[PDB]
Design a binder for this molecule. Structure first.
Ligand SMILES: Cc1cc(C)c2c(CP(=O)(O)O)cc(=O)oc2c1
Ligand SMILES: [Zn+2]
Ligand SMILES: [Zn+2]
Length: 229
C-alpha cells in the first residue's frame, strides 16, 4: 500500500485522499516521521502540512504532478513547528497559496519558520471564520484549543470518514504525548476531546507521527492528557 518516492512515503487513504510522510534526523534520537495530507477536490489539489524541509516539500509536489497531475490550489499548515511548516518556501516557489492560523504566522519567525501568506482566524467556538479560508472545498478547519501547541489546528475532510489531528493526537497505543516543549498541559485533554466532538463522523483519525487509527486515538490521547493536570 505504501509508495516509496525518493526519501518520502505516500499512502492512499480514500479515493481522493493520500497521506504524505517525510523523515528528519533528531540527533541522538533517530529519524522522526511526520505525516500530512493531499486531497483532490475536482480539478485541483489541496495540501495539509509541508514536509520537514523545502527539498522534501518540492518532492511532494513532484509526486502530485506524476500521480495526480492537477494544480495545487492551496496548502494549510497546522502549527509553527518544522514538521508542519518547514517547507513553506517550496510552496511559495511553486506559486501555491498558503494558509495558517494567524497565531502560527505570528510565531513563525521566532520558531525559525517562514510564515504562510494568509492568516486564518477562528470563532469563539473554534470553527474557522469562513472568509479567511476561501476555496477550501471539503477541508473543514477547526481550532480545538491549546494542546500540543497553543496554535495547533485540525482539519476534517467533508465527504470522507477522515479527520486530521496533526500533532495534537497520538495513536491508541502511544506511550507518551511526544514533544511537550510548547504544549499547554492544562488544556490538552479538553482540546483533544474538542477535536473529536468537532468531527463526530470521522472514523479514520490521521495524525503527525503514527499510521491512521480509529477514534480510540482520540480517547487514548485525551486519557493520557488527563494525567498532565
Ligand atoms: C524540542 C523538540 C521540538 C520539536 C519541534 C520536535 C519535533 C517536531 P513536533 O512534533 O513537536 O511538531 C519532533 C520531535 O520528535 O521532537 C521535537 C523536539
Ligand atoms: Zn509540533
Ligand atoms: Zn509532531
Amino acid at each position: 500500500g505504501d509508495q516509496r518516492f525518493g526519501d518520502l512515503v505516500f499512502r492512499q487513504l480514500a479515493p481522493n485522499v493520500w497521506q504524505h510522510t517525510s523523515y528528519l534526523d533528531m540527533p541522538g534520537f533517530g529519524a522522526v516521521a511526520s505525516n500530512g495530507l493531499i486531497v483532490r477536490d475536482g480539478g485541483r489539489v489541496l495540501v495539509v502540512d509541508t514536509a520537514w524541509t523545502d527539498d522534501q516539500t518540492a518532492q511532494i509536489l513532484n509526486w502530485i504532478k506524476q500521480e495526480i497531475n492537477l494544480p495545487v490550489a492551496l496548502a494549510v499548515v497546522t502549527h509553527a513547528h518544522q514538521d508542519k511548516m518547514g517547507g513553506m518556501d517550496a510552496l511559495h516557489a511553486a506559486g501555491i497559496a498558503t494558509y495558517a492560523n494567524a497565531l502560527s504566522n505570528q510565531l513563525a519567525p521566532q520558531e525559525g519558520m517562514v510564515a504562510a501568506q494568509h492568516s486564518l482566524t477562528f470563532a469563539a467556538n473554534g470553527w474557522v471564520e469562513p472568509a479567511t479560508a476561501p476555496n477550501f472545498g471539503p477541508l473543514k478547519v477547526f481550532y480545538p484549543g491549546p494542546g500540543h501547541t497553543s496554535d495547533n489546528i485540525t482539519v476534517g475532510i467533508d465527504g470522507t470518514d477522515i479527520a486530521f489531528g496533526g500533532c495534537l493526537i497520538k495513536d491508541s497505543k502511544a506511550k507518551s504525548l511526544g514533544n511537550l516543549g510548547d504544549a499547554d498541559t492544562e488544556h490538552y485533554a479538553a482540546s483533544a476531546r474538542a477535536f473529536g466532538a468537532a468531527f463526530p463522523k470521522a472514523s479514520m483519525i490521521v495524525m503527525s507521527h503514527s499510521a491512521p487509527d480509529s477514534r480510540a486515538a482520540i480517547t487514548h490521547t485525551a486519557r493520557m492528557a488527563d494525567k498532565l493536570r
